[PDB]
């Protein structure tokens, strides 16, 4: 909606990069619509992205810039999780109540529940957040949630 018209140029810069990456032609594969938006700072769920036109695989539909406008606009309204919800989520997996979840349990929730991530994605986020298990094989989920929420450069 009330995009800064800066967020429009922002979207233009992102669009151009992705357009370039699947063949510079002024169109971005619809399978990348979600990733474009993610580059603009938002965290849409798969389901949010499909609902605005994102497709399920490469090579199905290609979209021009003007198509990305309403899509990005629509996604900004997408619900984003809060720290409270994340802690409430993980708390359910904390039998002991000491803020720990086993590295295995964490990998399980991330790859088997909700809109499941791949074991490779999990590998990458664990690596990027430099998440470490203690001697018992456990991790402090609060730290992980905070690292994830803060971003790759660490205030996001």
């Amino acid at each position: 909606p009330k995009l800064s018209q800066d967020e429009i140029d922002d979207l233009k810069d992102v669009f151009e990069l992705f357009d370039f990456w699947d063949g510079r032609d002024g169109a971005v594969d619809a399978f990348k619509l979600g990733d474009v938006c993610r580059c603009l700072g938002i965290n849409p769920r798969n389901e949010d992205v499909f609902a605005v036109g994102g497709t399920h695989k490469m090579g199905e539909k290609s979209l021009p810039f003007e198509e990305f406008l309403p899509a990005y606009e629509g996604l900004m309204d997408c619900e984003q999780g809060t720290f409270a919800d994340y802690m409430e989520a993980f708390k359910t997996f904390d039998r002991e109540g000491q803020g720990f979840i086993s590295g295995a349990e964490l990998r399980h929730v991330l790859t088997a529940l909700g809109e499941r991530l791949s074991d490779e994605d999990v590998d990458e986020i664990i690596k990027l957040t430099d998440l470490q298990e203690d001697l018992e094989g456990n991790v402090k989920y609060e730290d992980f949630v905070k690292k994830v929420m803060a971003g790759p450069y660490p205030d996001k």
Partner: protein
């Protein structure tokens, strides 16, 4: 339940966001890199088909 499921998915979306945003700088750098490669190879291809370069190249061995 359905709430827990949604919360978990929102957390995964944060993760998906993190990963793609992390990858952004590398994609920008690589576009520059692929641009350089594509451009200079083409320049080389054009040069190779320029009659003057063909003449110059055949003549070199005699210098």
């Amino acid at each position: 339940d359905e709430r827990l499921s949604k919360i978990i998915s929102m957390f995964q979306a944060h993760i998906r966001g993190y990963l793609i945003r992390k990858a952004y700088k590398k994609l920008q750098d690589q576009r520059i890199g692929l641009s350089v490669i594509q451009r200079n190879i083409r320049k080389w291809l054009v040069l190779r088909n320029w009659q003057w370069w063909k003449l110059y190249s055949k003549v070199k061995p005699l210098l």
